[PDB]
Design a protein around this ligand. Structure first.
Ligand SMILES: Nc1nc2c(ncn2[C@@H]2O[C@H](COP(=O)(O)OP(=O)(O)O)[C@@H](O)[C@H]2O)c(=O)[nH]1
Ligand SMILES: [Mg+2]
Length: 221
């Protein structure tokens, strides 16, 4: 038996991953309840991950795979769920700190995500191209006055991820984005049939909300 396609919700500790699920829901294998909001209207599953670094590997593995399917346990009888998209959630308020530490740890996680998918696109011992799996970079907590707006978030990540691929090539496959690219932009990931877009929103409090996110996603699965 099979289930609705699922969207991998990944991001660092404290982004609001666990928070967003409940909203989604309230409207290693994975143990999701196939209930109401995803079922009744959203026709896909939102799959939560752990935030800690020690645990990122399992999340990353799914991303290497040319045709990723997730094994889910509803609330015995195991299912498979076609991985069709990814939501990269981060705390946009914590990003604002002058020290620049949040951006660094966060851009590192984000790097491996896009590069994993990048390897997955190239990797073809099966001769056909692998299916497009878009990543949505969701800048959460837009209700806080101190939260960084989505357009800055977009720009800040590119500069760090570009900084990352630069510092590593100076290690004289691990190169994110195009090989001839002079400065990094998410738009150049289109060359590997992966769509990456930064979008702001919030789960609790007063602001943009989360439906724009889901609308992006549902428009893409
Ligand atoms: N201000 C604000 N706080 C949020 C929002 N979403 C989540 N949080 C809080 O930020 C923290 C993030 O925690 P959590 O959901 O456990 O994130 P996780 O570590 O990634 O699983 C929690 O205390 C949430 O209550 C939001 O939209 N706005
Ligand atoms: Mg959590």
């Amino acid at each position: 038996y099979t289930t609705l396609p699922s969207v991998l919700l990944i991001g660092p500790s404290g982004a609001g991953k666990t928070a967003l699920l409940t909203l989604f829901e309230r409207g290693t294998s994975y143990k999701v309840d196939l209930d109401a909001a995803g079922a009744t209207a959203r026709k896909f599953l939102l799959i939560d991950t752990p935030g800690h670094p020690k645990l990122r590997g399992t999340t990353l593995q799914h991303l290497l795979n040319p045709s990723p399917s997730l094994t889910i346990i509803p609330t015995s009888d195991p299912y498979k769920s076609k991985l069709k998209a990814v939501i990269f959630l981060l705390d946009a308020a914590a990003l604002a700190d002058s020290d620049g530490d949040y951006l660094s740890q966060t851009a590192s996680y984000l790097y491996d995500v896009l590069l994993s998918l990048q390897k997955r696109f190239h990797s073809r011992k099966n001769s056909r191209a692998p299916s497009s799996i878009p990543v949505l970079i969701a800048a959460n907590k837009q209700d806080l006055f101190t939260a960084v707006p989505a357009s800055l978030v977009k720009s800040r990540l590119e500069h760090e991820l570009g900084r990352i691929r630069k510092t590593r090539q100076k290690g004289l496959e691990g190169w994110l984005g195009a090989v001839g690219s002079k400065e990094f932009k998410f738009e150049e990931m289109m060359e590997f049939d992966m769509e990456v877009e930064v979008m702001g929103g919030n789960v609790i409090g007063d602001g943009p909300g989360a439906e724009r996110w889901w609308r992006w996603i549902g428009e893409r699965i």
